[PDB]
Scaffold this active site. Structure first.
Site, short mmCIF file in Angstrom:
data_model
loop_
_atom_site.label_atom_id
_atom_site.label_comp_id
_atom_site.label_asym_id
_atom_site.label_seq_id
_atom_site.Cartn_x
_atom_site.Cartn_y
_atom_site.Cartn_z
N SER D 133 0.78 -1.25 0.00
CA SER D 133 0.00 0.00 0.00
C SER D 133 0.81 1.30 0.00
N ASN D 140 -5.30 0.77 -8.52
CA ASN D 140 -5.01 0.68 -9.95
C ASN D 140 -3.51 0.47 -10.20
N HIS D 312 -39.68 -9.91 21.51
CA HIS D 312 -40.26 -8.97 20.56
C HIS D 312 -39.79 -9.37 19.16
N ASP D 401 -7.12 -4.73 3.50
CA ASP D 401 -6.76 -5.96 2.79
C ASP D 401 -7.38 -5.95 1.39
N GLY D 403 -9.71 -3.00 -0.53
CA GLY D 403 -11.10 -2.59 -0.44
C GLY D 403 -11.96 -3.36 -1.42
C1 LIG Z 1 -4.45 -5.47 5.42
C2 LIG Z 1 -3.09 -5.60 6.13
C3 LIG Z 1 -3.21 -6.36 7.45
C4 LIG Z 1 -1.83 -6.69 8.02
N1 LIG Z 1 -3.94 -7.63 7.25
O1 LIG Z 1 -3.45 -8.57 6.30
O2 LIG Z 1 -5.11 -7.91 8.01
N2 LIG Z 1 -2.43 -4.30 6.35
C5 LIG Z 1 -1.68 -3.97 5.29
C6 LIG Z 1 -0.51 -4.68 5.01
O3 LIG Z 1 -0.08 -5.50 5.82
N3 LIG Z 1 0.20 -4.45 3.83
C7 LIG Z 1 -0.23 -3.48 2.91
O4 LIG Z 1 0.40 -3.25 1.88
N4 LIG Z 1 -1.39 -2.76 3.20
C8 LIG Z 1 -2.09 -3.01 4.38
N5 LIG Z 1 -3.20 -2.22 4.69
C9 LIG Z 1 -3.60 -1.18 3.72
C10 LIG Z 1 -4.94 -1.53 3.06
O5 LIG Z 1 -5.05 -2.95 2.94
C11 LIG Z 1 -5.02 -0.95 1.65
O6 LIG Z 1 -4.56 0.40 1.57
C12 LIG Z 1 -6.47 -1.04 1.17
O7 LIG Z 1 -7.05 -2.31 1.45
C13 LIG Z 1 -6.48 -0.73 -0.32
O8 LIG Z 1 -6.91 0.62 -0.46
P1 LIG Z 1 -8.32 0.83 -1.21
O9 LIG Z 1 -9.10 1.88 -0.52
O10 LIG Z 1 -8.92 -0.51 -1.39
O11 LIG Z 1 -7.79 1.33 -2.65
P2 LIG Z 1 -7.41 2.87 -2.94
O12 LIG Z 1 -6.43 2.86 -4.05
O13 LIG Z 1 -7.02 3.51 -1.66
O14 LIG Z 1 -8.81 3.45 -3.49
C14 LIG Z 1 -9.78 4.05 -2.63
C15 LIG Z 1 -11.16 4.01 -3.31
O15 LIG Z 1 -11.13 4.60 -4.62
C16 LIG Z 1 -12.13 3.94 -5.43
N6 LIG Z 1 -11.40 3.28 -6.54
C17 LIG Z 1 -10.09 3.35 -6.78
N7 LIG Z 1 -9.79 2.68 -7.89
C18 LIG Z 1 -10.92 2.18 -8.37
C19 LIG Z 1 -11.96 2.55 -7.51
N8 LIG Z 1 -13.22 2.18 -7.77
C20 LIG Z 1 -13.50 1.44 -8.84
N9 LIG Z 1 -12.54 1.06 -9.67
C21 LIG Z 1 -11.26 1.40 -9.47
N10 LIG Z 1 -10.31 1.03 -10.32
C22 LIG Z 1 -12.77 2.86 -4.54
O16 LIG Z 1 -13.92 3.41 -3.88
C23 LIG Z 1 -11.64 2.58 -3.54
O17 LIG Z 1 -12.20 2.06 -2.33
C24 LIG Z 1 -3.74 -2.34 5.97
C25 LIG Z 1 -4.63 -1.38 6.45
C26 LIG Z 1 -5.06 -1.41 7.78
C27 LIG Z 1 -6.02 -0.34 8.28
C28 LIG Z 1 -4.59 -2.43 8.62
C29 LIG Z 1 -5.01 -2.47 10.09
C30 LIG Z 1 -3.71 -3.38 8.12
C31 LIG Z 1 -3.27 -3.35 6.80
C1 LIG Z 2 -32.44 12.42 22.66
C2 LIG Z 2 -32.06 13.56 23.60
C3 LIG Z 2 -31.26 14.66 22.89
C4 LIG Z 2 -31.01 15.85 23.81
N1 LIG Z 2 -31.98 15.13 21.69
O1 LIG Z 2 -33.38 15.34 21.75
O2 LIG Z 2 -31.27 15.37 20.48
N2 LIG Z 2 -31.33 13.10 24.80
C5 LIG Z 2 -32.21 12.75 25.74
C6 LIG Z 2 -32.99 13.72 26.38
O3 LIG Z 2 -32.81 14.90 26.15
N3 LIG Z 2 -34.01 13.34 27.26
C7 LIG Z 2 -34.26 11.99 27.54
O4 LIG Z 2 -35.15 11.65 28.32
N4 LIG Z 2 -33.48 11.02 26.91
C8 LIG Z 2 -32.46 11.42 26.03
N5 LIG Z 2 -31.63 10.43 25.49
C9 LIG Z 2 -31.88 9.01 25.84
C10 LIG Z 2 -32.52 8.27 24.67
O5 LIG Z 2 -33.38 9.17 23.96
C11 LIG Z 2 -33.37 7.09 25.15
O6 LIG Z 2 -32.74 6.33 26.19
C12 LIG Z 2 -33.72 6.18 23.98
O7 LIG Z 2 -34.22 6.90 22.85
C13 LIG Z 2 -34.74 5.15 24.48
O8 LIG Z 2 -34.03 3.94 24.70
P1 LIG Z 2 -34.26 2.78 23.60
O9 LIG Z 2 -33.00 2.04 23.37
O10 LIG Z 2 -34.96 3.39 22.45
O11 LIG Z 2 -35.33 1.89 24.42
P2 LIG Z 2 -34.91 0.85 25.57
O12 LIG Z 2 -36.07 0.80 26.50
O13 LIG Z 2 -33.58 1.17 26.13
O14 LIG Z 2 -34.86 -0.53 24.73
C14 LIG Z 2 -33.67 -0.98 24.05
C15 LIG Z 2 -34.04 -1.96 22.94
O15 LIG Z 2 -34.87 -3.04 23.41
C16 LIG Z 2 -35.74 -3.45 22.34
N6 LIG Z 2 -37.15 -3.23 22.78
C17 LIG Z 2 -37.53 -2.87 24.01
N7 LIG Z 2 -38.86 -2.87 24.09
C18 LIG Z 2 -39.34 -3.22 22.89
C19 LIG Z 2 -38.25 -3.45 22.05
N8 LIG Z 2 -38.47 -3.82 20.78
C20 LIG Z 2 -39.70 -3.97 20.31
N9 LIG Z 2 -40.75 -3.76 21.09
C21 LIG Z 2 -40.61 -3.39 22.37
N10 LIG Z 2 -41.67 -3.17 23.14
C22 LIG Z 2 -35.41 -2.56 21.14
O16 LIG Z 2 -34.38 -3.19 20.38
C23 LIG Z 2 -34.88 -1.31 21.84
O17 LIG Z 2 -34.02 -0.59 20.94
C24 LIG Z 2 -30.50 10.86 24.79
C25 LIG Z 2 -29.47 9.96 24.49
C26 LIG Z 2 -28.29 10.41 23.93
C27 LIG Z 2 -27.17 9.40 23.65
C28 LIG Z 2 -28.14 11.76 23.64
C29 LIG Z 2 -26.84 12.28 23.02
C30 LIG Z 2 -29.17 12.65 23.93
C31 LIG Z 2 -30.36 12.22 24.51
#
Ligand SMILES: [C][C]([C]([C])[N+](=O)[O-])N1=C2C(=O)[N]C(=O)N=C2N([C][C]([O])[C]([O])[C]([O])[C]OP([O])(=O)OP([O])(=O)O[C][C]2O[C](N3[C]=NC4=C3N=[C]N=C4[N])[C]([O])[C]2[O])C2=[C]C([C])=C([C])[C]=C21
Ligand SMILES: [C][C]([C]([C])[N+](=O)[O-])N1=C2C(=O)[N]C(=O)N=C2N([C][C]([O])[C]([O])[C]([O])[C]OP([O])(=O)OP([O])(=O)O[C][C]2O[C](N3[C]=NC4=C3N=[C]N=C4[N])[C]([O])[C]2[O])C2=[C]C([C])=C([C])[C]=C21
Ligand SMILES: [C][C]([C]([C])[N+](=O)[O-])N1=C2C(=O)[N]C(=O)N=C2N([C][C]([O])[C]([O])[C]([O])[C]OP([O])(=O)OP([O])(=O)O[C][C]2O[C](N3[C]=NC4=C3N=[C]N=C4[N])[C]([O])[C]2[O])C2=[C]C([C])=C([C])[C]=C21
Ligand SMILES: [C][C]([C]([C])[N+](=O)[O-])N1=C2C(=O)[N]C(=O)N=C2N([C][C]([O])[C]([O])[C]([O])[C]OP([O])(=O)OP([O])(=O)O[C][C]2O[C](N3[C]=NC4=C3N=[C]N=C4[N])[C]([O])[C]2[O])C2=[C]C([C])=C([C])[C]=C21
Lengths: 430, 430, 430, 430
Positions: D133, D140, D312, D401, D403
């Site tokens: 890098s 490129n 929930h 490693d 992008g």
């Molecule tokens: C990764 C590694 C570690 C140790 N492991 O294996 O885990 N490390 C390293 C080593 O060792 N050796 C070397 O040589 N290096 C390293 N690192 C650094 C990193 O990997 C790099 O820098 C990256 O991945 C790559 O970068 P990127 O961002 O992917 O690429 P650039 O040239 O900067 O670019 C930006 C942007 O722009 C746009 N484009 C460009 N060209 C193009 C585009 N598109 C479409 N087509 C074409 N032809 C895009 O948007 C891109 O994204 C590292 C780091 C760190 C933080 C650690 C902790 C470690 C390491």
């Molecule tokens: C916001 C405010 C400011 C100044 N402004 O307006 O911009 N602050 C405040 C005041 O002023 N006053 C009062 O009173 N407070 C405040 N803060 C605190 C907050 O807002 C609170 O704590 C919140 O929003 C509420 O909590 P959450 O997380 O939403 O709820 P919880 O109870 O804790 O829960 C957790 C979890 O678990 C589950 N779940 C439960 N239950 C249920 C569920 N799911 C479905 N269904 C049912 N039944 C979920 O996952 C949830 O998430 C504040 C703060 C801060 C950091 C600042 C800077 C400021 C403030």
């Protein structure tokens, strides 16, 4: 750890690819000419027959039970390949697999041998279905203090009487609406449906699963089993999941999957947990098809420019995001299915892993298909490309087999909330 | 600063609503029985005719030019209401408005009063189209060193000869493929379409816009103007954007919209910038319908639970996200349209605001429809609900009227890269 | 519909800008040498004094009450400019404005006249604080059946006795922990603190707001009011919000803001509802500073390349997303503050708009800063640039002033759940 | 396919956990008192010494080379456990590993034996650094026709003379700024550093890597090697990445890693690809600490409510999203490091998997820490919790490693653009 596929896994993929490539590819030409959901479904029968002939239905049953299933990993690989080409018939297979899971999981050899026989024979078009979903919903079917399933069953003598309605169960009505070769009807035990479920009892203790075959249906009055409708879906237009109404439908006590109660609910939960894990392979398949088609397009089309659009960072970013979603999805699915097969692991651990899989894979699959379409541009919106069909079908995964919002996330939440919750038990053990 | 609507605007909404609920609602029953896009489009004619009678078409032409346009804010309010019910015919109106903009913006009273006559009469079903999009793409139509538009034009005597193909232009072919009442064909000037565009000449300096009417087409040979196809769209199935081919198509010199070069390109850019802003209104309408249908459902259905699903935080979170997206989108649209009418602001400022609106609104509109579906659950996947149609239609916005990835974001990036870029010029002045 | 800024608003921005650039910019060199939160806060005193002299504290009081407040839009414009430069002191001004709102909103002219006096004089550095937050949280303070506020008030003869602890209230202890010049202590009425809240009485009917001054504290025993600690924050390291313990703290009955119950709870809600809309201006200011620093960097740095990184589509996409977030945020804030000032709108509609604003602006602001840093790259991670500071400060907005997850989204969910909920009331009226 | 861990891998985890708990936990109390980056870095020396004594340094060198590294999976597990507790020293070990990589990957047993000797002796506190890098950036550095690396080298007699500045290289200056025990300086061959790089020659063909030890520095003039400053980082405040400026710095020809050109560039690319894969383990460790701290809080705190906040849904949703991001990340990392060790796959495949890993894990880790904070609420903003530190530390991953925006995604886009790109080669073989 390793990810090197075994010879049999590589063969399963090869076999699966050849199938839909030479069979499923010809499916569209047939159902595309049908005017309705049911007609489209029936039009796929010849293709399902081929699936059976290729032994894909027998592969849905464990070897110890006369089937040819090798493992959930083989199944996940096979599904990905099929859905990557044509979900039609492929979805019918997974539906059947689900319908069979309760029987496969129960501890009654005589029951399994009797009801799984037509599925391991390798002939005809045996259809199975797990009838759980209902018109009023099922996300809260186990909510203490809730109404519970609206499909109830009561024991009258040496038989059970089913009353209620089901909606969404795949192939539930079979090819001709006179019942699937095998249906596992999930019911709530109630001597009087007119009276609400006791809010002080655990809903899970009220669950019963009744096996219903075409024979069972033929032994009942015609108005005891009837299909009220066939939902027209946005995607998976060839699938069948009728609205069925049971009116004093008699079922032999011998057809009880198991003793009503927690054991029955546990079987339904286990079946749906394994399904949730496999649904990922389906999402990956559909999403992969979109990705590969966008990839091919981006590397061979400049869109009137001086270079292939894949050279434009914005286009590449979309494809990169798609690739990452597919890669992470497949790995999660494989981890899930392998976790489910680890006897040394607690069920709560297996359930959590399965829930994560279904939630993640189905959500990103939708994103992957959309991003692929954005990268391709306007041309992805025309029927001359696969995208239109793929979007409608991928949108089903996050909703079906237990929606993520209402069911899967809740099931996972419940496990995480337990005091003895072990976050990484499936990875680092205890 | 204020957001209160004037009596004029409030009346526009009411009228838009009345029209959409009285006319548009009956459209589905007509085009739903058609087999192809074109047939579905023609089936909407009686509805377009009604829109003309309601002055919706005349409202696309500014008062000074003989129209009845009040403001872009009025137009946006109208579009939101129309698209919230039925995109059919509505999309035809916006299409005609786009094809009209080039003439509306040109400084030639002669061409205006001549070509805008049928669109202000308030009779018949006059269709206008801006033919820009082509089969090879147009995202790089202005790239220096690139192929450029494939639809070229050359001067021969006292007339122009068009050569090339167009794809996607709405109503470009008219109701009977005999051409729209008015079409603005965007071409790249070239004396020999056989040779590639000069890599040392700025593409924008060679752009020309020729006005082609049914008469123009009638005065040419049958094979000079031919429709090669009508793409089957995943959504907006009642729209028409055929694949037209021009072969030695002769156009009178008197039909040149303006001087070829930057002025012509400017008109096209300006026309697409304005429509880009109004697209947000269409996206909002579509996304609003999904949000509302999901909201109503969440406040009336318990999904077999003990309370309305809206009481579930996860469901509420989805509805909240949709609400915010729609809210922020409408404000952006309104800001954009007003900015476009503020003659005290430079073009780059207006352009950037218009791009921002198109990019944001279309992108979040997709997320809004999908989140709504996830809230409703499985039932949103059935065609008995609007979601199936809404998903397909909404996925078009991010792609059409200049895709976000290839066009809009690039146009905005260009302005931001300029040395005199004024980030908040549209808000805190320059 | 008008986004044109009036001369007074444009003048407000100029004034804020001048103050920020002339005063606030010198703050860092003073508090950066301090080793603790309190010391850093105290170091900003010689800067708050300037704000007072500039009439920034007086501007927090409406004209009818002797202040110089022009409107919430002016305040919004002023806060954006102030936070875009330095949160120090600016946050203190916001804190005081919050602590003043309860009194500003009450219906007691005599009370207002008495307690607002030192804040409209433009002399010294008067500090105000709305003490509501507590150690155990407050998201469920109004939850029926819950423990409610742990800070309780007991009516004893002609005085009120406060017991409990507060945590987070900005500058509640004044500059020397001898108390703020004015504090609005929100308490739960309880005749016996050692007893839990009655699960049969709505918490909102037991809310009382007691005004506490340095005098009230002086009139009490030394250990009746004590500061237990001063939390070290990730960002806004110059703000004060100590852990205060009230033990048999006597407060004159005349210091009662209003009649305990729904009316008192109503004042607290409206106050926090107004600040919720203004925090958006603070979020925009911090995010704008990140965006502008990334924009300038991207337009002048090539990063060893052959062109300004802004020319790279990926960098531009990031900048484009930040610009859109900032643009949509400002519009939302203006719409919110404008809605809050509309006397022709029900409170429900105003509250909803205020929640949407706080949730959207604070969430999107965090993404804006992160995206700005990714665009800039590795350099944005060194303290020679201002990103490190902007990151820690922006992360506060989603959490403070009523967290989005626990409080704001919940208040909005409640409103939407109502049977008479009007989604677009704030835009298209009723 | 298998995810089970071997006894050695579980022992490695137990060993890492023990080291982090008995040693790393005492680091904060030592460096927290120091005033600057270097001082903090130096305060970790005693801890790095223990790491050496625990054989963690020797574990960075492959077994075939006399090291003790069992495999990249063992390394990934060790890093996750270390970073979950304290990034200090842990990041130092990582820095050394990267510095030794070029030598570990070169095909010269003599060089390896000579330069790796101190790192496998198991004594002292040897530091290594890969100095690549630079102040002007390096995204490129391989762009054809661009400036290229500004740190150049030229052959003079039987040695090389380095000219230029490096910025960011970790531990480059060693503990006392007299240089790291081993440094791999990446230079661009140029006979005249005052002249621009030849725009007609592929930059990769001019890459050279020179090994510089403390002895090399000591054998040069004091002005030839000097530290110009130590950047203050937002996070990882104990890391050292000086700004060095080589001036006529002489290096023995025998210290040349290999023949200048594609082979040298190949070693750098490979070293950085492996680092990119391991960085995911660091991101996971940091994100996991946030997740677990929020999980514990959410299951033991009601926040003044009647039930633990994990009850929930909005809170559970945040923790579910975090868990999923963590699970999918660890799997992707295990897959990546395994793919890197697969001698049957071509480089392009290993590279693609390594980039996907760095891109996904670092990006997702940021979201995980934020969602965890939003879940915990206000209390997460105080330094009495670890969130503040974690936020600053996690934000470095997506940027360092290489992008994701400028390097990693561009490297992946390059591979995908290749005509022989095999998307699933790492999974389903070639
Ligand atoms: C990764 C590694 C570690 C140790 N492991 O294996 O885990 N490390 C390293 C080593 O060792 N050796 C070397 O040589 N290096 C390293 N690192 C650094 C990193 O990997 C790099 O820098 C990256 O991945 C790559 O970068 P990127 O961002 O992917 O690429 P650039 O040239 O900067 O670019 C930006 C942007 O722009 C746009 N484009 C460009 N060209 C193009 C585009 N598109 C479409 N087509 C074409 N032809 C895009 O948007 C891109 O994204 C590292 C780091 C760190 C933080 C650690 C902790 C470690 C390491
Ligand atoms: C916001 C405010 C400011 C100044 N402004 O307006 O911009 N602050 C405040 C005041 O002023 N006053 C009062 O009173 N407070 C405040 N803060 C605190 C907050 O807002 C609170 O704590 C919140 O929003 C509420 O909590 P959450 O997380 O939403 O709820 P919880 O109870 O804790 O829960 C957790 C979890 O678990 C589950 N779940 C439960 N239950 C249920 C569920 N799911 C479905 N269904 C049912 N039944 C979920 O996952 C949830 O998430 C504040 C703060 C801060 C950091 C600042 C800077 C400021 C403030
Ligand atoms: C899946 C299946 C297939 C064959 N496979 O396996 O692949 N299928 C089926 C079968 O088979 N069977 C049965 O039974 N079923 C079925 N399906 C149906 C479905 O799955 C169902 O329906 C679903 O998934 C469930 O639903 P959801 O949606 O999820 O739920 P709900 O109840 O409806 O709900 C709605 C909504 O709401 C809300 N929530 C509720 N609750 C709650 C909530 N949240 C929160 N929390 C709570 N608690 C939410 O939002 C939800 O979502 C099927 C289907 C189809 C289409 C196919 C093709 C197949 C099938
Ligand atoms: C829009 C319109 C309507 C009527 N309105 O206005 O509403 N329409 C039309 C008309 O009218 N006219 C014309 O001309 N056209 C039209 N359309 C068509 C559309 O718009 C078009 O096509 C679009 O927008 C464009 O495309 P895009 O996709 O955007 O582009 P392209 O060329 O194709 O491309 C694709 C892709 O690739 C890529 N890239 C390229 N380049 C580039 C890129 N990236 C980066 N950078 C660069 N440079 C991207 O990814 C893209 O995307 C229409 C349509 C429809 C459907 C309707 C209904 C209507 C219409």
């Amino acid at each position: 750890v390793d990810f090197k596929l075994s010879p049999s896994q590589l063969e399963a993929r090869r076999h699966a690819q050849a199938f839909a490539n030479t069979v499923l590819t010809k499916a569209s030409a047939e159902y595309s000419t049908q005017k309705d959901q049911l007609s489209r479904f029936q039009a796929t029968r010849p293709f399902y027959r081929e699936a059976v002939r290729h032994g894909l239905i027998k592969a849905q049953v464990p070897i110890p039970l006369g089937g040819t299933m090798e493992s959930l990993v083989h199944e996940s690989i096979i599904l990905e390949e099929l859905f990557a080409v044509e979900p039609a018939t492929s979805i019918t297979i997974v539906a059947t697999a689900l319908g069979l899971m309760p029987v496969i999981l129960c501890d009654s050899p005589s029951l399994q041998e009797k009801f799984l026989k037509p599925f391991i024979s390798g002939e005809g078009e045996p259809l199975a279905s797990l009838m759980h979903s209902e018109p009023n919903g099922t996300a809260n079917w186990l909510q203490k203090g809730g109404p519970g399933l609206q499909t109830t069953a009561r024991k009258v003598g040496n038989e059970w009487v089913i009353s209620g309605e089901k909606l969404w169960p795949s192939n539930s009505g079979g090819w001709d609406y006179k019942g699937a070769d095998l249906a596992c009807v999930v019911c709530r035990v109630s001597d009087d449906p007119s009276k609400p479920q006791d809010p002080n009892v655990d809903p899970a203790t009220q669950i019963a699963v009744l096996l219903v075959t075409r024979e069972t249906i033929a032994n009942n009055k015609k108005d005891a089993y009837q299909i009220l409708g066939e939902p027209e879906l946005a995607g998976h237009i060839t699938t069948s999941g009728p609205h069925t109404r049971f009116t004093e439908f008699h079922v032999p006590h011998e057809n009880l999957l198991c003793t009503p109660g927690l054991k029955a609910q546990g079987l339904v939960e286990t079946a749906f947990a394994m399904s949730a894990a496999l649904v990922g392979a389906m999402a990956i398949g559909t999403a992969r098809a979109a990705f590969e088609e966008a990839l091919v397009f981006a590397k061979s089309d400049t869109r009137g420019g001086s270079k292939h659009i894949i050279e434009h960072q914005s286009v590449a970013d979309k494809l990169i995001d798609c690739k990452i979603r597919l890669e992470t999805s497949r790995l999660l699915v494989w981890k899930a299915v392998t976790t489910l097969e680890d006897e040394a692991l607690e069920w709560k651990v297996k359930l959590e892993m399965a829930m994560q899989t279904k939630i993640y894979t189905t959500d990103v699959a939708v994103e992957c298909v959309i991003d692929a379409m954005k990268a391709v541009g306007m041309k992805s919106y025309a029927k001359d490309m696969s995208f239109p069909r793929l979007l409608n079908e991928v949108m089903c995964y996050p909703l079906f087999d237990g929606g993520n919002i209402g069911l899967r996330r809740r099931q996972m939440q419940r496990v995480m909330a337990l005091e003895d919750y072990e976050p990484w038990a499936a990875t680092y053990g205890s």
